[PDB]
Structure formats: structure tokens, C-alpha cells
Amino acid sequence: MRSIARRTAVGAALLLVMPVAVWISGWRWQPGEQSWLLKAAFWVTETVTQPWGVITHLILFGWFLWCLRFRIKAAFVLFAILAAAILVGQGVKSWIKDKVQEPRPFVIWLEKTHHIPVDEFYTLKRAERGNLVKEQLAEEKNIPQYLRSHWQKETGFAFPSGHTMFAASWALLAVGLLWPRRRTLTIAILLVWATGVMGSRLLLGMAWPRDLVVATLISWALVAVATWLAQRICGPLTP
Numbered sequence: 044m045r046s047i048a049r050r051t052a053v054g055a056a057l058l059l060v061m062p063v064a065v066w067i068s069g070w071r072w073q074p075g076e077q078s079w080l081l082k083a084a085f086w087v088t089e090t091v092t093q094p095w096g097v098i099t100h101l102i103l104f105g106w107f108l109w110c111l112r113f114r115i116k117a118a119f120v121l122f123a124i125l126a127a128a129i130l131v132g133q134g135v136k137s138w139i140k141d142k143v144q145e146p147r148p149f150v151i152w153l154e155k156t157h158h159i160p161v162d163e164f165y166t167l168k169r170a171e172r173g174n175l176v177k178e179q180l181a182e183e184k185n186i187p188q189y190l191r192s193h194w195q196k197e198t199g200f201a202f203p204s205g206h207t208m209f210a211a212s213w214a215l216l217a218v219g220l221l222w223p224r225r226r227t228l229t230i231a232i233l234l235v236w237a238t239g240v241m242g243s244r245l246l247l248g249m250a251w252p253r254d255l256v257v258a259t260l261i262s263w264a265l266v267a268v269a270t271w272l273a274q275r276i277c278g279p280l281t282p
């Protein structure tokens with residue numbers, strides 16, 4: 044267990060760099076940003092937002108099980124563990140957002156520009172908030188249609204970062220399960236991919252580094268258990 048906590052903590056440290064840096068800078072999101080960088084950021088984000096959220100979890104689990112090389116009986120358990128891992132992560136994210144009631148960077152701008160209180164905006168039904176955001180943004184035209192539609196779709200609170208929990212958890216599961224087999228390429232790729240998603244969430248005016256630094260911390264604490272259980276129940280990572 045001691046190892047799982049250190050291993051994943053090293054990977055957590057590497058992901059934490061990006062939001063800690065974006066935090067210290069005191070960077071504040073602005074609209075109609077670098078068009079080429081926003082399309083690139085959004086597509087990175089598209090690897091994690093549903094339905095592609097399930098596809099990625101599956102593709103990743105498929106590659107994970109393939110590396111770990113478990114039996115049919117163990118494979119089943121490895122899926123149940125990882126599925127639970129990513130599902131507890133998103134379940135934590137919700138029973139926090141609703142309690143902290145933090146607004147999103149696009150919402151603060153959209154409601155400040157339409158001189159509508161952000162607190163009264165969040166008083167509304169998530170359905171009618173999406174109805175409002177579709178109608179208010181249609182007046183902007185400066186914002187691209189891919190992002191404009193993604194905004195209506197999302198709405199809701201910002202603290203902590205859901206995408207950066209899915210993505211951070213998978214890069215952390217890579218250090219927690221594929222580092223004893225020493226599969227560096229996967230660990231490195233998944234770290235960069237998760238970091239890009241964390242980057243993408245700031246770039247599209249959706250989250251604060253506060254959400255990312257806390258979301259990485261939760262993903263770590265959850266993965267450090269999930270990978271421990273996976274070792275005890277499924278079997279050793281190493282033969």
C-alpha cells in the first residue's frame with residue numbers, strides 16, 4: 044500500500060503543476076480567445092465529455108487489462124473496481140458543487156454582460172438555465188457554435204472539476220497499475236492527455252485552478268484506494 048500512495052502521489056504532483064502555475068499567475072479567462080487553440084482545446088475536452096466519456100473509460104480499461112494481463116475472473120473485478128473508481132469520483136464532484144455553489148468563468152461573464160445576477164441565474168432550473176444561455180449567447184455571435192452549444196449543455200457549478208477528475212484519475216490509475224510493469228509510454232501519454240484536458244477546461248472558461256488542484260487531490264485519494272483494492276482482489280501487477 045505504502046508504494047501505491049507514493050507512486051500515485053508522484054503522478055498527482057506532475058498533474059498539479061499546471062493548475063498551481065495557472066493559479067499563481069492569477070490568470071482570468073476572457074471570451075473569443077485564440078480560435079485555433081480553442082478548437083484544439085475543445086477536441087481535447089471531447090475525449091472526456093459524454094458519450095465519449097464512457098468510450099474512453101472502456102478503451103482505457105481495455106488497454107489497462109491488456110497491460111496488467113489478468114485472468115477472466117480477475118478482469119471482471121478490475122472492471123468493477125475502475126468503474127467504481129471513476130463513478131465515485133463523479134459522485135463526489137456533485138455532492139460538493141451543489142454545496143459550494145461556485146460559478147463557472149463563462150457564466151460570470153455571460154450574466155455580468157447581460158446584467159443578470161449570477162446568484163439569481165443559479166436559482167433557475169438547469170433546463171431553463173440552458174434555455175437562457177442558448178438565447179443570451181445567440182446575441183454574442185463572437186463565440187463559436189461548438190463552444191456556444193457546449194455551454195448551454197453544461198451550465199451548473201464549477202468547484203471541483205469533473206473532466207479533470209475523469210482524466211486525472213486515469214493518469215493516476217496508470218501510475219497506480221502500470222508503473223510496476225514499467226509501462227512509461229502509457230503513463231507519460233495519459234499524464235499529458237489529462238494535463239491537456241485540465242488546460243482545456245480553463246481555456247473554454249469552465250473551471251478555476253482551485254477546482255483542478257482539489258479535483259486532482261480527490262482523484263489521487265480515490266486512485267490510491269482503487270489501485271490498492273485492485274492489487275489485493277485481482278492480483279499482483281508484477282509476475
Ligand SMILES: CC(C)=CCC/C(C)=C/CC/C(C)=C/COP(=O)(O)OP(=O)(O)O
Nearest residue numbers: 092093096097100203204205206207249250
Ligand atoms: C464507463 C464509465 C463508468 C464512465 C464514466 C464517464 C463519466 C461519468 C464522465 C463525465 C462526463 C461529464 C458530462 C462531466 C461534466 O463535468 P463538469 O462540467 O461537472 O466539470 P468541470 O467542467 O468543472 O470539469
